[PDB]
Design a protein around this ligand. Structure first.
Ligand SMILES: CC(C)[C@@H](CO)Nc1ccc2ncc(-c3ccc(C#N)cc3)n2n1
Length: 340
């Protein structure tokens, strides 16, 4: 229900650090973490890339005094209007961030704060996100347009499935914003699920809906239903990620107008051709039945018929998954980053 001050929330975190900003020469520091650059300005959010002891870190900034001013109508239960700030949401995220500890999820290494500014230390996943988006999805650049090899995709999927197992089953947490931006790779190349800003604790394995990224939201959000199965939601979205991994494009949900999108999802059958179908089109390999056999199991409209994560993990498709395929993929991909 209602949550206390930031201090109450962090009151059980055993690695809370007092803020110390200082300047040494031509450099700005946060507690021995040297500021290299800000990786993205999510207007709010904000992730700062730092160095400390020859290691790269990613510290997410958060500002109470900015976040508590940004407030929207949430509409109550009692006809008397309620109102949530983006600081309320952050208090929820803090709780979760405060208890995610898992090798397949991006886990904070410590939290720096004065109880207004918060810098949350994470490892920097040097191979960046799975895919990036600009007009469309790509791996590295966009004059060069390569698709992730199917052997690599298997691992990625298996890995986030292992993330799912922990958050759903050990933690009772639904991610809610499973998305390529949120699937991260290190140089080595492990895959972690990241960003719990829309994630929430489940009640009887369910969430109250409408939250996350529009085109990764499942058909049920568009139904009669007031509550949804958390796992099945996360599964759908991983389904979209897989579809994106196949084609470098989102299924039926191709932006512009959302009515177009929202009218589609619940009603539309997805097109399942071969890799570059959607893609020779804005530019002036193959897929087998089995690849698509498997993706369809993710994107079934009735969530009760939608694959569980258990039956996905031990499906014949991921049976021949080889961690080495991803490792080699990652090692060469990192070599391309060592200057582009
Ligand atoms: C938008 C990008 C700046 C961002 C998210 O896709 N990319 C990256 C790239 C490397 C990396 N290493 C750690 C992190 C990172 C750390 C924390 C969060 C959170 N919450 C989200 C991402 N990240 N995030």
């Amino acid at each position: 229900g209602p949550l206390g001050s930031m201090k109450d929330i962090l009151s059980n975190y055993s690695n809370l650090i007092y803020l110390n900003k200082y300047v040494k020469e031509k450099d700005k520091y946060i507690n021995d973490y040297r500021i290299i650059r800000t990786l993205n300005q999510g207007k709010f959010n904000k992730i700062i890339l730092c160095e400390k002891d020859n290691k790269f870190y990613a510290l997410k900034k958060y500002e109470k005094s900015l976040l508590e001013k940004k407030r929207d109508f949430t509409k109550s239960n009692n006809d008397k209007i309620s109102i949530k700030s983006k600081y309320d949401d952050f208090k929820n995220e803090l709780q979760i961030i405060t208890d995610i500890k898992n090798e397949y999820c991006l886990t904070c290494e410590g939290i720096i704060t004065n109880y207004d500014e918060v810098y949350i230390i994470y490892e920097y996943m040097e191979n960046d996100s799975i895919l990036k988006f600009d007009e469309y999805f790509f791996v590295l650049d966009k004059n060069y347009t390569c698709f992730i090899p199917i052997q690599v995709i298997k691992c990625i999927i298996k890995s986030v499935l292992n993330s799912f197992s922990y958050i759903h089953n050990e933690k009772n947490i639904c991610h809610r914003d499973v998305k390529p931006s949120n699937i991260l790779m290190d140089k080595n190349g492990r895959v972690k699920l990241s960003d719990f800003g829309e994630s929430e604790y489940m009640v009887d394995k369910k969430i109250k809906g409408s939250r996350g990224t529009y085109e990764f939201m499942p058909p049920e959000f568009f139904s009669n239903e007031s509550s949804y199965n958390g796992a099945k939601v996360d599964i759908w979205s991983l389904g979209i990620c897989l579809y994106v991994m196949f084609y470098n494009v989102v299924p039926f949900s191709l932006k512009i107008s959302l009515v177009e999108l929202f009218n589609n999802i619940r009603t539309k059958n997805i097109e399942y051709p071969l890799d570059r179908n959607h893609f020779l089109y804005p530019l002036t390999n193959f897929l087998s039945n089995e690849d698509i056999d498997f993706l369809k199991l993710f994107l079934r409209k009735n969530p009760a018929e939608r694959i569980t994560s258990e039956d996905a993990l031990k499906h014949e498709w991921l049976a021949d998954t080889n961690i080495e395929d991803l490792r080699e993929f990652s090692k060469e991909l990192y070599k391309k980053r060592k200057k582009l």
